[PDB]
Structure 1
Amino acid sequence: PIATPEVYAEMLGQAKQNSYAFPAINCTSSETVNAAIKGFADAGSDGIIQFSTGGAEFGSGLGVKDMVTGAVALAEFTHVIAAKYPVNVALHTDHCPKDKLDSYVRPLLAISAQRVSKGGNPLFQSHMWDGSAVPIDENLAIAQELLKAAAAAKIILEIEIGVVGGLYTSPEDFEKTIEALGAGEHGKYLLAATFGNVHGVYKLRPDILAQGQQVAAAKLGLPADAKPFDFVFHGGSGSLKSEIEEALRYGVVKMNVDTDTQYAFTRPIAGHMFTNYDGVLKVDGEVGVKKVYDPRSYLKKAEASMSQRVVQACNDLHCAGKSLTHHH
């Protein structure tokens, strides 16, 4: 099923408690959503499906190019599909900068607030505010008001302090975050801190995350080994095993996956076109071969390949076999 707000909070709390994380898979379409959920289900895992600003725009079609429309359309599709699987699937929106808040996150929050007001659950279970391009104080002022709106709609907020590529987060940056937002008692939030992490597969310092947890623990009057933050790891695709393991130990509960699942989705499509070149093209006066230019023929292979890569992510992040539905 779609993760209820209660289930999603429990997912993240269990991940943190047990030092594992969920892959958050960027999707752009019915096929990619289907591949992701099938991957989670094959791994006996709960998981997160996220739509970026560009993914949402693509989802809305070339005739619309509207982020809210695309996100809502894909979310409505995902609600129907996820009801047929025995794992929990949470819906999330990815990086939204300041000048897109009024055209992405805010209208989506408003839609969910309306659902909640009528006794329903929110359409998305988390939204990202990406304030890494603005000064920390401005970032956290926006985060504070968004956290209030988000919590009131039963939604978890993801925020980012410092910049993802494609200087590190200071102890004071971590300190300000705890001071402005608390440690979950004013609403759950996820924190993307910057520790040398980059988008795309081509100098990670996971110790920055360990430092953030210690700085927060000291601020809160907690034991030295406490982990007050739930961290998000941006630029997950292409990471070393030892680096992932360290990140998990320091409280990463969500790792974003996009590049690696894109390659997995495209790879069998390329193979299909090449081996069926004279079927997918009308060559030498012939009319091609409908059975191989039927989009389903190669898109089913793309779906299966992407699902395999998602299963790998679940095993790498150690959430495989741990779905809170306990289908074994």
Structure 2
Amino acid sequence: MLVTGLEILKKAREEGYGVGAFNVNNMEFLQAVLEAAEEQRSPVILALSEGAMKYGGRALTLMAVELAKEARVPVAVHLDHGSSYESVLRALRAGFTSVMIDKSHEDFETNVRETRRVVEAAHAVGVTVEAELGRLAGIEEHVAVDEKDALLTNPEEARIFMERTGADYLAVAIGTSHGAYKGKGRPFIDHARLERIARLVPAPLVLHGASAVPPELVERFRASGGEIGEAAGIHPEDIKKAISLGIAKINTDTDLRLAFTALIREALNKNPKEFDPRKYLGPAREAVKEVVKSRMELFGSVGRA
């Protein structure tokens, strides 16, 4: 059934497990995610980016919200990385139960202002919100004692931010190639920093830009004729510990796209006479479902429904 992002994330952090926020853009992806959730008897968050809102439109938001209601596990429909107030209004209009406004690339003061306005609007309609701080602001004049300490989230500032915005959950910069830290060092997790943040912020925490990108998956993609860089993803064990420390929401997208694309390639490379979409989109949908089920297993949400 359909519930707020907070109902799901609060329980998750309380009970020490993670919930995957899986990005979907069409029917097959949405089906894959919900079936995985049902088979794993696990709560799940359906994530729709603005790219998804544009590509999928009313058809996608109709499915996400109505199918979420019919699910036998708790489901939340979440706007992934909203870039404007209007984008959030559109998500509220479409029945979303969780919204995220990303103004972390803005100065602390503007980020606060922008976020607070989204919070006020979302709360007026019973929707919870995810805000994002991903760089030392210097608010309490903290000095970056290191290059990384500069582009990553400061515990004290996070506490202030959440106190000021009233956001429900927070995405923090802790090492994953995302935001200011992007393209600036090897993908990792600053567990020490995560613990400090979690100590000052009891709200569930969110982890962005952290796909497993396992070797077998990349291998299959390359084998199917795909080309990709030396993709590096957070190590399974780190995700496991990050969750034990307070991360309740884990964004997942890349791994699904790769699996989906890999099988379509395999199907078309092997069956050149095939022009019935279902024959090649079907197994791709299945491959996606498998990735999702594995993520839920790794995150520890199996049977948490």
| TM-score higher than 0.5 | yes
Q: How do 1:169-318 and structure 2 match up within 5 A?
A: 169-181=153-165, 189-198=168-177, 203-214=188-199, 216=200, 228-238=202-212, 239-277=234-272, 279=273, 292-318=274-300
What CA distance in whole angstroms lies between the structure 1 residues aligned with 2:8 and 2:134?
A: 26
Extract structure 1 runs of 4+ deviating beyond 6 A.
none
Asked if 2 retains the 8 angstrom alpha-carbon contact of 1:136 and 1:173, the reply is no
Deviation at 1:268, TM superposition (A): 1.4
1:242 Cα offset (Å): 2.0
Mark the runs of 5 or more structure 1 residues left unpaired by the alignment.
60-69, 113-122, 183-187, 217-226, 280-291, 324-328
Tell me the distance in 2 between the aligned counterparts of 1:24 and 1:178.
21
Q: Deviations over 1:207-229 (max 9, x none)?
A: 22211123x2xxxxxxxxxx612
Map Cα deviations across residues 127-157 of structure 1 (whole Å, 9 max, x no partner). 1110111011211122222212111111111
Distance 1:129 1:79, change over 3 A: closer
Contact between 1:23 and 1:255, CA under 8 Å: does it hold in 2? yes
CA distance in 1, matches of 2:91, 2:205: 23
Matched, 1:101 2:97: no
How far off its partner does 1:84 sit? 4.3
Alpha-carbon separation, structure 2, partners of 1:140 and 1:84 = 36
Overall identity of the aligned pairs, in %: 28
- The separation in 2 between residues aligned to 1:171 and 1:42, in whole angstroms, is 37
Please tell me whether Structure 1 or Structure 2 has the larger radius of gyration of its CA atoms.
1
Deviations 1:278-306 (A, max 9, x none): x0xxxxxxxxxxxx311011111111110
Q: How many residues align?
A: 263
1:83 Cα deviation after fit:
4.4
CA contact (8 A) 2:24 2:52 kept: yes
Pick closer, same or farther for the CA change 1:28–1:202 going to 2, 3 Å: farther
Determine the C-alpha separation between the residues in 1 that align with 2:246 and 2:295.
Answer: 17
1:286 — aligned with what?
none
Gaps of 5+ in 2: 136-150, 213-233
2:36 to 19, 39, 43: 39
Q: Distance in 1 between matches of 2:160 and 2:40?
A: 38
- CA distance in structure 2 between the partners assigned to 1:133 and 1:79 by the alignment: 30
Q: CA RMSD in A?
A: 2.1
TM-score by length of 1: 0.75
Q: Please give the alpha-carbon distance, in whole angstroms, between the structure 2 residues aligned to 1:46 and 1:179.
A: 28
Q: Check whether the contact 1:195–1:205 (CA below 8 A) recurs between aligned residues.
A: yes
SS in 2 for 1:95: strand
Pair 1:28 & 2:25 matched? yes
Question: What SS does structure 2 have at the residue aligned with 1:195?
Answer: coil
| Distance across 2 between alignment mates of 1:29 and 1:15 | 27
- The question of 1:139 aligning with 2:111 is answered yes
Any idea what SS the aligned residue of 2:81 has?
A: coil
CA distance 1:236–1:4, change in 2 (3 Å): same
Which whole-Å CA distance do the structure 1 matches of 2:241 and 2:72 have between them? Answer: 30
